[PDB]
């Protein structure tokens, strides 16, 4: 069977708040032309936060 | 044809590393350094506006410096030889489509690859790829040495040695005991490219005799302009060594682009060879040599397979009859990519 993933609006928007409030390890991903990708990406100025948990090597 | 068709890449290289030897240890990395410089205020918009309309500044305003931050790399004093090496694997992977949405398209692409194999032709591609390895063009801007030696080992036990690579041309005839090694190498590769279930792996090293403190040119990173003025504007690529230190390197796809520079089939006038591209892109002149308007590009030619197979099947083979259009197409299938919406 072929699978196509898609990003959840509700889930990503919550993560942007939790990492800054709970002080989690994170970084930022840039998007050119934020208005062409979506409501949230535009509101965030083209910078979106993600979790960063590398292995202890 | 059909909605979806694609091939993966059949010839893939590694990351090249620069190093040198000492009397105390066999592997010491070449490394990069960072520094502040005083630049110039020059160029347009610095003094002119619009179309040559001087803008209003005072005479002294251009005598000021323009500071910048760059990374750079030099060979340290008293090192007689610099060494560079990489690994190469080749798979016979152009015999079958990665994906295809149409059984009638599929059986035809298969027919063609086989019709070609038995008449000869893989030798032609192998000869061209082999020449580019032994010539040394994959050093790009670092070819300006006082002497270059190239050595190759393979998984089949062979070894090749070019005593001095600085004079081997694209067009011409090589010296004895060099021309011969080109023939032998061609045979190993021509097979690796087309016959499956053969594992082949190569290890290519070279040495550069250099100047007293010669500048070295590794791959450059792609970056954003920093806003800090404490961060370098020109950053160079490095690789982590097994001991934890960093060393200057050349990126895989930069080695790759050099190895596949073999297309001198365009316009019936060889000139210099191009990097194979579906549209014949020419980076130096910022243009394209197989513009769709000419009928010479990959996508027009992809539809003449039925006619080509017919010719290949009717031909005797073993001669010089294979046309430019068939060779071109096979070269593109080797650098596999997405050929959809056909």
């Amino acid at each position: 069977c072929v699978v196509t993933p898609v990003v959840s609006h509700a889930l990503l928007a919550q993560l942007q708040n939790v990492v800054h409030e709970k002080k989690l390890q994170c970084t930022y991903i840039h998007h050119d032309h934020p208005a062409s990708v979506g409501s949230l990406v535009g509101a965030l100025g083209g910078k979106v936060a993600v979790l960063d948990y590398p292995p202890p090597v | 044809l059909c909605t979806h068709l694609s091939y993966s890449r059949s010839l893939s290289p590694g990351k090249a590393v620069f190093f040198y030897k000492t009397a105390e240890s066999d592997f010491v990395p070449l490394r990069i350094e960072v520094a502040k410089i005083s630049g110039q205020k020059c160029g347009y918009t610095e003094g002119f506006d619009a179309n040559l309309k001087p803008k209003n500044i005072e005479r002294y305003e251009l005598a000021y410096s323009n500071p910048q931050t760059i990374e750079a790399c030099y060979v340290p004093p008293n090192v007689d030889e610099l060494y560079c090496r990489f690994s190469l694997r080749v798979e016979a992977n152009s015999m079958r489509p990665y994906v295809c949405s149409n059984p009638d398209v599929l059986r035809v692409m298969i027919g063609l690859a086989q019709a070609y194999q038995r008449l000869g032709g893989y030798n032609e591609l192998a000869r061209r790829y082999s020449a580019n390895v032994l010539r040394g063009i994959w050093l790009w801007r670092n070819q300006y040495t006082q002497g270059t030696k190239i050595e190759i080992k393979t998984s089949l036990g062979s070894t090749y040695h070019i005593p001095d690579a600085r004079r081997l041309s694209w067009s011409g005839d090589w010296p004895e005991l060099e021309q011969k090694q080109l023939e032998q190498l061609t045979s190993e590769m021509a097979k690796a490219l087309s016959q499956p279930d053969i594992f082949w792996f190569a290890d290519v090293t070279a040495s550069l005799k250099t100047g007293f403190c010669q500048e070295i040119f590794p791959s450059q990173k792609f970056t954003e302009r920093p806003d800090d003025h404490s961060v370098a504007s020109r950053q160079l690529a490095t690789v982590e060594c097994s001991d934890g230190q960093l060393a200057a390197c050349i990126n895989p796809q930069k080695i790759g682009a050099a190895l596949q520079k073999i297309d001198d089939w365009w316009a019936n006038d060889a000139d210099l060879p191009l990097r194979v591209h579906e549209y014949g892109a020419n980076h130096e002149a910022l243009t394209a040599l197989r513009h769709p308007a000419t009928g010479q590009d990959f996508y027009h030619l992809l539809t003449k397979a039925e006619q080509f197979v017919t010719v290949l099947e009717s031909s005797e083979g073993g001669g010089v009859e294979l046309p430019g259009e068939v060779h071109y197409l096979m070269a593109v299938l080797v650098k596999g990519g997405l050929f959809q919406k056909g």
Binding site: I29, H30, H31, D32, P54, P55, V57 | D197, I198, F199, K221, F222, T223, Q235, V239, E240, S242, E278, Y279, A281, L286, T287, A288, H291, P292, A293
Partner: protein, 71 residues
């Protein structure tokens, strides 16, 4: 198993695979740019291999075929 893990900075430049205009133009444009993250690995794998048939092939030939099959 993880023996080495190195993060690489920056991002890849796309091949100029898109014509600036469909017809009567000899200029090539860049499709667009993405922001991703990449690394270099060194790792070992231990695979639990099972053969259904009662008689197995524990031979040098199979070791060569195990080297060839490797993606």
């Amino acid at each position: 198993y993880l023996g080495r893990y190195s993060l690489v900075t920056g991002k890849h430049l796309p091949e100029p695979s898109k014509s600036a205009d469909p017809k009567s133009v000899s200029a090539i444009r860049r499709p667009g740019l993405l922001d991703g993250r990449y690394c270099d690995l060194g790792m070992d794998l231990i695979i639990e291999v099972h053969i259904p048939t009662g008689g197995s092939l524990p031979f040098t030939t199979c070791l060569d075929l195990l080297r060839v099959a490797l993606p």
